[PDB]
Write a protein that binds this ligand. Structure first.
Ligand SMILES: Nc1ncnc2c1ncn2[C@@H]1O[C@H](COP(=O)(O)OP(=O)(O)O)[C@@H](O)[C@H]1O
Ligand SMILES: Nc1ncnc2c1ncn2[C@@H]1O[C@H](COP(=O)(O)O)[C@@H](O)[C@H]1O
Lengths: 227, 225
C-alpha cells in the first residue's frame, strides 16, 4: 500500500497507494482517495509529534499522496502500543473486547512476513541484534507517541485503541520514528458508538472504508476531504 | 476556605466554606454555594483517582460541604504540576502565557505562609526531612494524578493548566494524596475560549466566580448545581 522510491542516500519518497490488502493479500481492493487520506493523515500526525519534540523521518510533502522522508537504517520491528483490548490481545489476556487498560501495553513483533510477524521479547530482540538500551529508548518513544496521539484524538471523540510504529537509525545514530501513521496502522473507534474508523472496516466488511477514513480526516481538520 | 475538625486519631472532617481569599487575605469575599461546589468537585476528583488506584485521604461525604478524610502526617509541601505556561512559570521560563509544555513540569514549594511558600528543590527537601525516595514517589504520584485529571477534563473541553497537590503519610507509612482538588487549587481553562473557570476569576476580577465553578460542575456531571 506504499511505494518507497529512493531520492538519494539521505532521502526517499514514500508514496501512498489506493490499494487495500488484508490476510496476507488473500483479500484485496482499491479505494479511490485512500492513498491521499493516508498520506495527509501521516503528515498531520508526524507534524503533531515533531511539535512535541519526537524525532520522525518526516521531511516534507511532494504531492497529495507523496511524502519526502529521511532514509533510515530500520529496526526489524513492528512496535504495537495498546490502550484498549482489541484483536489479538483477546488471545493473550483474559479480558473482553473494549476493556480499558490501566496502563498502555507495548508489544514487540519481529518484522518478517515469512514467520507472519511473530511476537518477541527483549531476549529475542538481542538475538536480532537490538541492544536492551535501544529497546528501552524505542518503548519510551512509543509510549510518548501514544500519549500525544491518544490525547489529541480523544478531544475529537476518537479512541486510540491500539497502533503500530516502526523505527530506524539516522546518520547521527539517533532513533527516529518512521513508516506511516494512518487508519491502516491504527485502530480508531468513535468515542460514543465504538464503531471502527480504520482498516478493520475493510478487514471485516463492517462498512464503507473511504467513508470511515474521511470521518477521521474531517474530525481532525474540520474540513471535508477534496484534493 | 476549609475547616479541619478532628473526629479522632484516624479521621477528620474537611468542611468547605463559602469564603474566598486572595493575596494573603488582603482580598476577600464570600460566594454562596462555593463550598458546596468545591466539596463536590473534590469528591468527584478523589473518587476518579481512587478508581485508578491512587491512594487518597477521601473516606466519605458527611453533608454537601463536608468530607470525611483520613488523618495524615502531612509533608510540608505544595506540589505543583503544570501542563501549560501560566502565572509564576512566566517568571521562570522565556515562554508566553498559554504555551503548551512538551512534558508536565513538577515544582516543589515549601508550605510556609511566613516565607510565602518559596520554591525548593530536592536538596532543600532533604533539609526539611524528606528523603529523595519519598520525593521521587511524590512526583511519580503527582504525574499520574496529572495525566488522569488532564485527560478526563480534556474530553469535556477543559484544559488542566496547572494544579497544586498536597500529600501525607498514613498509619502504614504509605504516601497518600490529601487536601482538596477544586477550582480553588487548579487552573482550568475553557478549551475553545481559553477563559478561566477557576479561582483566577476572583483573583483578577475576570468574571463571575460561582458562574465559572458551576460551569466546571455542569460539564463534569451533566447536571446544573
Ligand atoms: N488528610 C489530612 N490530614 C491532615 N492534614 C490535612 C489533610 N488534608 C489537608 N490537610 C491540611 O489541612 C489544612 C486545611 O486547608 P486550609 O484550611 O486551606 O489550610 P491553609 O489555607 O492554611 O493551607 C491544610 O493546611 C492542609 O495542609
Ligand atoms: N524512513 C524510512 N527509511 C527506510 N525505510 C522505511 C522508512 N519508513 C518506512 N520504511 C520501510 O519501507 C517499507 C514501506 O512499507 P510497505 O511497503 O507498506 O511494507 C517498509 O518496509 C518500512 O519498514
Amino acid at each position: 500500500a506504499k511505494k518507497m522510491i529512493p531520492i538519494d542516500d539521505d532521502k526517499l519518497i514514500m508514496e501512498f497507494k489506493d490499494d487495500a490488502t488484508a490476510f496476507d493479500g488473500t483479500k484485496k481492493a482499491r479505494f479511490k482517495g485512500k492513498g491521499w487520506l493516508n498520506a495527509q493523515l501521516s503528515v498531520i500526525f508526524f507534524k503533531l509529534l515533531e511539535e512535541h519534540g519526537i524525532k520522525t523521518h518526516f521531511i516534507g510533502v511532494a504531492g497529495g499522496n507523496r511524502l519526502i522522508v529521511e532514509k533510515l537504517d530500520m529496526y526489524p520491528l513492528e512496535v504495537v502500543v495498546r490502550n484498549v483490548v482489541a484483536g489479538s490481545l483477546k488471545k493473550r489476556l483474559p479480558l473482553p473486547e473494549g476493556y480499558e487498560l490501566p496502563e498502555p501495553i507495548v508489544e514487540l513483533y519481529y518484522k518478517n512476513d515469512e514467520l507472519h510477524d511473530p511476537m518477541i521479547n527483549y531476549y529475542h530482540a538481542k538475538v536480532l541484534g537490538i541492544s536492551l538500551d535501544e529497546i528501552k529508548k524505542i518503548e519510551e518513544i512509543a509510549l510518548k507517541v501514544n500519549e500525544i496521539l491518544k490525547d489529541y484524538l480523544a478531544k475529537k471523540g476518537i479512541i486510540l485503541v491500539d497502533f503500530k510504529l516502526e523505527f530506524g537509525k539516522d546518520k547521527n545514530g539517533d532513533i527516529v520514528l518512521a513508516d506511516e501513521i494512518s487508519p491502516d496502522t491504527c485502530r480508531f473507534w468513535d468515542a460514543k458508538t465504538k464503531r471502527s474508523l480504520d482498516k478493520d472496516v475493510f478487514r471485516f466488511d463492517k462498512g464503507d472504508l473511504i467513508e470511515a477514513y474521511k470521518e477521521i480526516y474531517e474530525r481532525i481538520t474540520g474540513e471535508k476531504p477534496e484534493f
